[PDB]
Design a protein around this ligand. Structure first.
Ligand SMILES: [Mg+2]
Ligand SMILES: [Mg+2]
Ligand SMILES: [Mg+2]
Ligand SMILES: [Mg+2]
Ligand SMILES: [Mg+2]
Ligand SMILES: [Mg+2]
Ligand SMILES: [Mg+2]
Ligand SMILES: [Mg+2]
Ligand SMILES: [Mg+2]
Ligand SMILES: [Mg+2]
Ligand SMILES: [Mg+2]
Ligand SMILES: [Mg+2]
Ligand SMILES: [Mg+2]
Ligand SMILES: [Mg+2]
Ligand SMILES: [Mg+2]
Ligand SMILES: [Mg+2]
Ligand SMILES: [Mg+2]
Ligand SMILES: [Mg+2]
Ligand SMILES: [Mg+2]
Ligand SMILES: [Mg+2]
Ligand SMILES: [Mg+2]
Ligand SMILES: [Mg+2]
Ligand SMILES: [Mg+2]
Ligand SMILES: [Mg+2]
Ligand SMILES: [Mg+2]
Ligand SMILES: [Mg+2]
Ligand SMILES: [Mg+2]
Ligand SMILES: [Mg+2]
Ligand SMILES: [Mg+2]
Ligand SMILES: [Mg+2]
Ligand SMILES: [Mg+2]
Ligand SMILES: [Mg+2]
Ligand SMILES: [Mg+2]
Ligand SMILES: [Mg+2]
Ligand SMILES: [Mg+2]
Ligand SMILES: [Mg+2]
Ligand SMILES: [Mg+2]
Ligand SMILES: [Mg+2]
Ligand SMILES: [Mg+2]
Ligand SMILES: [Mg+2]
Lengths: 68, 95, 155, 114
RNA sequence: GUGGGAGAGGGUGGUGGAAUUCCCGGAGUAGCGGUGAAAUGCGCAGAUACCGGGAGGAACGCCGAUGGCGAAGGCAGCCACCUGGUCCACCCGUGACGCUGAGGCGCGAAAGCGUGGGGAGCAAACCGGAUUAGAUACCCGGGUAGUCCACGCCCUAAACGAUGCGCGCUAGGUCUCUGGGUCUCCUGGGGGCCGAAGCUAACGCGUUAAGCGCGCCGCCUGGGGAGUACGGCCGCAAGGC
């Protein structure tokens, strides 16, 4: 279930877009690994940098509790 | 109690109580030394001292060998001490 | 028993009640191979089991055996630096064996002078739930239980 | 007197503690492996967690508690057993959430943990 | 020179959340904590577990990698500024302007030192509890320097790839990071693995050589005595060369 396919053509590097970015976080809030996001290396970097900006802005979380 | 066998040798009350005294070193560990038995013996190279002892946690067996009889006996106790500290501490690897 | 599984012998059923459980018992009464002896005791007791408390000595015997077999027992493992008494169920094999053993053992500690009487009475009481044997059972079983929380170290 | 409320499970390697709260999160009653007759490492066991979670729910039911959400903290031997035991309590277990706290690489741990 | 790229390279300011500790308010009761098992310790003077509020310091989870960057030491939340190194393309400028490098100069982990801040967590020394024959330890409960910041010193190391720098030459296979191309692939620069030849005492090395060659520098010459003594230079001392 690879994520870059689960979504269209986008801008990773756009920190305001919470609907795209939310997909790249796990259920627990963690930045998902390449093994999931399907980003390349260079990509996955730009991802995490911008995810992080967004979480400072209040948009994406930092942690989330795990619901069973 | 403690028995000493001087094999093919003419031993003495004095050196007997000396070996009783050297063996006393193992009393250090405070563990029952059951019917200990030393054997003193000549040999062309030098003397030989054997001892075989059972304790609640196992048995000690060892041979000392040397020119001087007394250094043979010491060697014997030195070897016995090691064996005794090992029976006493061995499973403490209980993590 | 390193190698395979250790066969449990079956046993010739007895020449009075035709039931294996009796010979095992008689076997447990036996001492120094003298089996004829081991027999009369059981049967003599069986005289007494009818004489007093008129009933079916077979019934009484087979009852007090089920009144003895321990359902749960402790068997102790070394873990780390302490030896834990551990709760485990007894095999039907082992329960029989523990049944018969405590029965006799407790029998022979009774104050009765004549052996078969001792056997008579111990069985009559165990049928009812009273005696040295029964205790040993209930005992072993409270010693399990209370260890219930060591039931995870269980093989 | 509250029917809806919360169960907090504190599960360490040493013990298991259950505290039941109001919906606001104020303790109604609590229990631990120690509250049952266990001392030493026996407190740590899953059986102990169970016995503790029961007694906690039990006590809670006397204040008329029926529904709880269950909140779980720590990695214990008794973690799962406590969860189980509340479900078999007669309490409703309206949910289960893991809140176990974790540093984003915080304070230096005691030497044991390095 | 022009034009592009990747990066935890360095310095300065600022800034976010998780967590630990403490304090305050609430609610609650008989234990919590800890170990191999315990005890010291904390707790009815209300602890632990739970909720709200506050203070403060340090380190930055996921991403994260066998990854990246740096001459080495070493460098990791996020933002901006100042700034070094380095790679690719174009084949445009100069015209051997190179290589190495005794001395010199500068950088140099941790610990340590000075002056002044700061101090949550951790923790030499130190105090207890256990373990043990004993236990000036390992394990447990406490705990001060220090760990953090500024400035100034110290100059060490298993400071390691135990492998000095530059250049040229000598099969390939595989996966990986980062460029450029007419994109199965081709091709530079880097990080790994397996291996031609060849090397090696063996282990192993092998276009990231320990192969084949040139240049320059450093170093070795049996073990201990000893990185000691003496002299000298350096340092506040420790102590370094
Ligand atoms: Mg405990
Ligand atoms: Mg920086
Ligand atoms: Mg800053
Ligand atoms: Mg309070
Ligand atoms: Mg009071
Ligand atoms: Mg709080
Ligand atoms: Mg690396
Ligand atoms: Mg290094
Ligand atoms: Mg030209
Ligand atoms: Mg020209
Ligand atoms: Mg120089
Ligand atoms: Mg330094
Ligand atoms: Mg320092
Ligand atoms: Mg110093
Ligand atoms: Mg000092
Ligand atoms: Mg200082
Ligand atoms: Mg100071
Ligand atoms: Mg302090
Ligand atoms: Mg002393
Ligand atoms: Mg001490
Ligand atoms: Mg300590
Ligand atoms: Mg401490
Ligand atoms: Mg303090
Ligand atoms: Mg290394
Ligand atoms: Mg060197
Ligand atoms: Mg050099
Ligand atoms: Mg390469
Ligand atoms: Mg490099
Ligand atoms: Mg190789
Ligand atoms: Mg070859
Ligand atoms: Mg190659
Ligand atoms: Mg070589
Ligand atoms: Mg020499
Ligand atoms: Mg010497
Ligand atoms: Mg030195
Ligand atoms: Mg010197
Ligand atoms: Mg000098
Ligand atoms: Mg001077
Ligand atoms: Mg000083
Ligand atoms: Mg040197």
């Amino acid at each position: 279930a690879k994520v870059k396919a689960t979504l269209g053509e986008f801008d990773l590097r756009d920190y305001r877009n919470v609907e795209v970015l939310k997909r790249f976080l796990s259920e627990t809030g963690k930045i998902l690994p390449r093994r999931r996001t399907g980003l390349s290396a260079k990509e996955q970097r730009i991802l995490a940098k911008t995810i992080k900006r967004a979480r400072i802005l209040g948009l994406l979380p930092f942690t989330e509790k795990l619901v069973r | 109690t403690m028995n000493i066998t001087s094999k093919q040798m003419e031993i003495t009350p004095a050196i007997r109580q000396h070996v009783a005294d050297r063996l006393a070193k193992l009393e250090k560990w405070q563990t029952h030394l059951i019917n200990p038995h030393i054997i003193l013996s000549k040999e062309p190279q030098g003397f030989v001292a054997d001892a075989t002892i059972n304790t609640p946690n196992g048995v000690l067996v060892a041979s000392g060998k040397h020119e001087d009889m007394y250094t043979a006996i010491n060697e014997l106790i030195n070897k016995l001490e090691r064996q005794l500290n090992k029976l006493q501490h061995k499973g403490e690897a209980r993590r | 028993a390193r190698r395979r599984r250790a066969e449990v012998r079956q046993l010739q059923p007895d020449l009075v009640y035709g039931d294996v459980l009796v010979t095992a018992f008689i076997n447990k009464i036996m001492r120094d191979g003298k089996k004829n002896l081991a027999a009369r005791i059981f049967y003599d007791a069986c005289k007494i089991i009818q004489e007093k408390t008129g009933q079916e000595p077979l019934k009484v015997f087979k009852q007090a055996v089920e009144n003895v077999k321990p359902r749960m027992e402790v068997r102790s493992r070394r873990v780390g630096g302490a030896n834990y008494q551990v709760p485990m169920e007894v095999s039907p094999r082992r329960q029989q064996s523990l049944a018969l053993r405590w029965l006799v053992q407790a029998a022979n500690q009774r104050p009765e002078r004549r052996a078969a009487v001792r056997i008579a009475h111990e069985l009559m009481d165990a049928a009812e739930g009273k005696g040295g044997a029964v205790k040993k059972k209930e005992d072993v079983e409270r010693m399990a239980e209370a260890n219930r929380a060591y039931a995870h170290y269980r093989w | 007197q509250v029917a809806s409320g919360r169960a907090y499970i504190h599960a360490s390697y040493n013990n298991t503690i259950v505290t039941i709260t109001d919906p606001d999160g104020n303790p109604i009653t609590w229990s631990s492996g120690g509250v049952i007759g266990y001392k030493g490492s026996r407190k740590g066991t899953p059986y102990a967690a169970q016995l503790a979670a029961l007694d906690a729910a039990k006590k809670a039911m006397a204040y008329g508690m029926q529904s709880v959400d269950v909140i779980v903290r720590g990695t214990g031997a008794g973690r799962e057993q406590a969860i189980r035991a509340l479900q078999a309590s007669g309490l409703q277990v309206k949910s289960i959430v893991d809140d176990t706290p974790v540093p984003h690489n915080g304070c230096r741990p005691k030497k044991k943990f390095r």
